[PDB]
Write a protein that binds this ligand. Sequence first.
Ligand SMILES: O=C(c1ccc2nc(C3CCCCC3)oc2c1)N1CC(N2CCN(c3ncccn3)CC2)C1
Length: 289
Amino acid sequence: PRRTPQSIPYQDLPHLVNADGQYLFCRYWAPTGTPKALIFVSHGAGEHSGRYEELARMLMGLDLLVFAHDHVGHGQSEGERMVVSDFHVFVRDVLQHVDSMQKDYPGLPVFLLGHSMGGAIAILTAAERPGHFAGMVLISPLVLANPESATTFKVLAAKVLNSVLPNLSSGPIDSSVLSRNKTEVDIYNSDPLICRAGLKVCFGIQLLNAVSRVERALPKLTVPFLLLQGSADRLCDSKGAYLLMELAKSQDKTLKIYEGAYHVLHKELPEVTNSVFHEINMWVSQRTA
Ligand SMILES: O=C(c1ccc2nc(C3CCCCC3)oc2c1)N1CC(N2CCN(c3ncccn3)CC2)C1
């Protein structure tokens, strides 16, 4: 019996098998009646789909069918943890899931919501299907990395590759600098489905590939979007938010900057998180009326 990394049989769980034969754990939040639209939620590196429960419940309350999976190497899905052969695998697997849901609900508009790496995945998914998605909501998407961090990582990756240095990775995710809400930090840290290990050089290289590919995709993007960004984001530099506003060709694009807020806006201080939920609710409501 194929089992999750936590030893639970997939036969008992919602799942999909991707093109590489790997089982991905799925999550669904369906309203009681006919949905007005579909929305795929794309989580970031080191986390998983269960971290979106409250956002998904809000969106389902707007009569959308919300759906997600754990990206390969994450959460309850198969794969070596926080490894991917090529970043495109994530996008391919999103497109499989979206295509399979759309055929079950033909004619319904489909939105994307993504955070951080999951925002880069959203951008690249929309760009691979020009004109197809109804909208995207991006919470601190990975567009430009913090320049000092990116340089540090490139130097590390070069040392590791050009001197074959062993047992060296980049640092782990530091949740304490990614939200001001200490309670949320503690909740995240004790989640059994996150990855707390150092980021491997091979995965970092794929995140740099994502950044490069995002920049090439931006001038091609036409999908409507809402972009939410914290000014004190230590991971996804706010300069990237401005680059997305500048280069996307979308006729419907809006940016809200949260002054002083850190990266994880949907798990931030209550004044910020409450606003984030409100803004997403209004923006999606207006576009599914
Ligand atoms: O997608 C990411 C992520 C993680 C690590 C990264 N490193 C880079 C750069 C580094 C330089 C080279 C180019 C790539 O980009 C990343 C993106 N995620 C999702 C985010 N996490 C943070 C922790 N979280 C959290 N923290 C506190 C409270 C609640 N949740 C959940 C979401 C981080």
